[PDB]
Ligand binder design. Structure first.
Ligand code: ZN
Lengths: 31, 76
C-alpha cells in the first residue's frame, strides 16, 4: 500500500535506508 | 586516474587510483595520506557505499571522480 523509500544524506551524501532516522555513516539525523 | 575525497570536515583529498582497482586500495591510500582507519572510513558515492570487495568500475567510477569520506565513530 504505502511502502517507504531510501533517502540520500544531506551532509555526506550517503544513501540511507527508509527506516534510518539518521545516517549510519556520518551519524547525522535525517532532514 | 585521480579521485577526489571530500570530507565532512571541509577538506578535499586528491589521490591516484584506477577504474580496475578495488575500494580497499582507495581506502588504504587515504590512510597513507591522512591516516584514517579503513574500518571507520566510509566511502560515499552519490548515494552509494563502496566496499573493499568491489571495484571502482563496479560502481561506475570514472577519472577525476569525487567521493565523500565519513568517519563512523562514537559522538552523538
Ligand atoms: Zn551521512
Amino acid at each position: 500500500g504505502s511502502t517507504s523509500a531510501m533517502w540520500a544524506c544531506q551532509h555526506c551524501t550517503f544513501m540511507n535506508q527508509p527506516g534510518t532516522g539518521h545516517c549510519e555513516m556520518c551519524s547525522l539525523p535525517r532532514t | 586516474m585521480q579521485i577526489f575525497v571530500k570530507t565532512l570536515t571541509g577538506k578535499t583529498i586528491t589521490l591516484e587510483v584506477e577504474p580496475s582497482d578495488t575500494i580497499e586500495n582507495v581506502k588504504a591510500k587515504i590512510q597513507d595520506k591522512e591516516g584514517i582507519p579503513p574500518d571507520q572510513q566510509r566511502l560515499i558515492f552519490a548515494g552509494k557505499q563502496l566496499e573493499d570487495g568491489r571495484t571502482l568500475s563496479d560502481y561506475n567510477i570514472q577519472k577525476e571522480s569525487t567521493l565523500h569520506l565519513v568517519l563512523r565513530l562514537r559522538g552523538g
